[PDB]
Structures are given as C-alpha cells and as structure tokens.
Amino acid sequence: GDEMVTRVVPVRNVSVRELAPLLRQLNDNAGGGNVVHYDPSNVLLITGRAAVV
Amino acid sequence: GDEMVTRVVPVRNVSVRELAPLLRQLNDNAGGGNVVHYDPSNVLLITGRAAVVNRLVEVVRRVDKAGDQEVDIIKLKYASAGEMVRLVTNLNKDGNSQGGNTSLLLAPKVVADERTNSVVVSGEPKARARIIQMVRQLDRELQSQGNTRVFYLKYGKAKDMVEVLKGVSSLAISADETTNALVIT
Amino acid sequence: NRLVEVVRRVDKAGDQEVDIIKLKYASAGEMVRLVTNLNKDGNSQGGNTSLLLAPKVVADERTNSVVVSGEPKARARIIQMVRQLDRELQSQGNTRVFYLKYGKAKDMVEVLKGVSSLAISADETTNALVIT
C-alpha cells in the first residue's frame, strides 16, 4: 500500500520518452515521494509507494 | 544514519547526465551537506549522509539496471545466419534507426556468425526473451524436399538436357555425366 | 577536504579502462562484426548524451583477444560477451568432407559448381569433395 520501493520496466517497442508527462504526472497525481526517469536505452525507472507504482 | 561519506556508482547503460535534476534535487530533498556530479565517462559521484546517499545510490544503481544491454549467444544448427540476418534486418526499429528523443541506437540489435552459425543479440532481456524465440522460429531444418533436387532421367540424356533447360533458366543447372542425372537449383 | 573530495569523486565517477583476455575459438573479427551492430555501446554522435565518451568494443586476430575500452560495468558485461561467443563448434563444422563411394570427386565438383553458381574442391587422391 504505502510501501516506497523503486522498480523498473523498459518500453522496448517504443522510446519510453512519451510517458514523461504521464508518469511524472502520476507523481503529480497523488501524495509525493515519487521519481520517474528515462534511459535512451529505453528502460523506465520508478521510485514510489506501492499503489502509485 | 547521519554518516557523511562520498560513494560513486556509474550508469553504464545511459549517460548519467539525466539524474542531475533528480539527485541534486535529492540534495534539495533534505538537510544539505550533499554533492552530486557527472563524468561524460558516465560514472555518477556522490557525497552526503548515510540515508540521503542510501536513496541517491538507490536512484543510481536503479537508472543503471533500468537500461540493461547484454549479449546472448546460442548455436543455430539449421538455417543460415546470413539469411537469419537479412530476414531480421527488415525488422527495422529493432535498434536499427536514427530516432532522436527515441534514442533507438541504444535499443536492442540483431546479428549472426556463419563460422559457428550463431545468433548474436545486443540489448535488453526482453530482447533476450523475444530473440531466443526468433532463434527457435528460424532454426527449423528442411523437410525432405530441399531447394535443390536431382532428377534421375530415364530416356533423356542429362548432358543434352542441361542445354535444353539452360534456355528455360536463361536458375542454375549441371548434369553429372556418370549417373546421367540433372542437378538444378 | 570536500572540494578535492568532489574532484577525485568526479575523477572516478567516469571510469574508462581496458581489459584483455584470450579468445581460444570463434574469430575476433566475427566477434567485432556481431558486436559492432551493438551501436550505442559507445558508437554514436549523441550531443548531451556524449556517448563518444562511453564504452567501446574491439578485438585482435593475432592473439585472438577481445579488447574493451570503458566502464567496469562494460568489463562486467563484455567479459560475459567474451564467454558467450568463445564457444567452440559441436562436431558438425562450417566445412564437411563427403567421401563419395560410386561417384568421382573431380567430376562431381563440376556438377555441384552449377548448384553453387558456396566453395568446392575435390581431392584427386582420396576422391573426396570438400564444400564450405
């Protein structure tokens, strides 16, 4: 539920760059403590509580 | 806990430049005494108290393991690595692009060796997962009927027939004078 | 104290060393070709990426040695890739020799040359066909 952990899924098919408004918007969706960021290697790395993640 | 130490993790997969807002923001997250900075040689160097650095280095190894790009080699026993290459090369955007913000030049790519007949992958574990499937998809053998057949002619002479068929081709023919058979491909 | 801390830090923050370990089996040049298609292992013109300063891959065919230039994460994953492609052949090679029993190797070469026209020779002595 409130468990703050970092977990990482790539978007292989597409450049993950297209989820930057979306997922940092999901940081911006509810109570913070979140990180979203993007590799040109096109893996999408996350940090946050269990639900937001 | 409050132990102020410097420790350094590279992001090999990606240029570490992308954690500059994030990690100096983690300086900016709580009570200061922090340093974050970046080598173009793409190691990420930190200074700070034990916790702030716990979640900093968390970010760094994370971004590091976020974008894996390893190679897997498994032997192909059957269909040609070069045909394997050609057919899959037309799978453009399996890492083969000039995409800008996409950066698809950092995405998984496909290869093969014809000395061992080995598929070569370079990229993601999703690429390991799906290209071990594509290894298996084309590692199929021939079923009896090949590309090349040999016709045993009974009443016709193979050497004379070659000339006849050469017109039709003019496809690659020779006739074996001994067994009087025609080898066309 | 904490200035020079920053400096040695930024110094070890972007490591770039080389590692040389012998390949015993499959060709360094093939090793080169197959990995060269791993573009973005240091092989790019990327701006703020600066991937021209990221790890790159090489080989020698005189010792048959892999050469790396970059990170220890590159040492870690390219010593894996050394081992992945350093596998030997399993009995069946690229080239086979067929012993023909009722057919003559020199005569068969010309027959097969059509099929190829793939690289053939026939040994007059043991009357065998060597195709690759």
Residue numbers in the entry:
A (entry chain G): 97 to 149
B (entry chain H): 97 to 266, 292 to 306
C (entry chain I): 150 to 266, 292 to 306
Give the exact sentences the study uses for this entry.
Pathogenic bacteria commonly employ the Type II Secretion System (T2SS) for the release of protein toxins. The system includes an inner membrane platform of GspC-E-F-L-M, a periplasmic pseudopilus composed of GspG-H-I-J-K and the outer membrane secretion channel GspD, called the secretin. In numerous species the targeting, assembly and stability of the T2SS secretin in the outer membrane require the function of a small lipoprotein that binds to its C-terminal region (the S-domain) and serves to pilot secretin monomers from the inner to the outer membrane via the LOL lipoprotein sorting pathway. In this study we used cryo-electron microscopy to characterize the structure of the secretins from V. vulnificus and A. hydrophila and in addition determined the crystal structure of EpsS from V. vulnificus.
First, we determined the cryo-EM structure of A. hydrophila ExeD as the paradigm of a secretin that is assembled through the actions of the ExeAB accessory complex. Analyses of top views of class averages revealed that, for both secretins, symmetry is unambiguously pentadecameric (C15 symmetry). The resolutions of the resulting symmetrized maps were estimated to be in the range of 3.4 Å for EpsD and 3.7 Å for ExeD by employing the gold standard FSC criterion. In ExeD, the sequence corresponding to the β-hairpin is absent and the structure is finalized by the β-lip, a common feature seen in both structures. The inner membrane ExeAB complex is both necessary and sufficient for the assembly of ExeD; in accordance with this, the Aeromonads do not have known pilotins. However, sequence comparisons reveal that ExeD does contain a recognizable S-domain including residues that could potentially correspond to helix α-12, a fully solvent-exposed, 8-residue helix that has been reported to bind pilotins in analogous regions in other secretins. In our ExeD sequence, for example, the conserved Ala-Phe motif is absent and is replaced by Lys-Gln, residues whose high polarity would not be able to play the same roles of the two hydrophobic amino acids of the motif. In addition, in our cryo-EM structure of ExeD, the last visible residue in the electron density map is Asp620. This indicates that the C-terminal tail, which includes the region discussed above, is flexible and not traceable and most probably does not fold into a stable domain. In contrast, however, the ExeD-EpsD-S variant, in which the EpsD α11 helix-containing region was also exchanged into ExeD, was both assembled in lower amounts and significantly compromised in function once assembled, suggesting that the interactions between this helix and the neighbouring monomer that are evident in the cryo-EM structure play an important role in both the assembly and the function of the secretin.
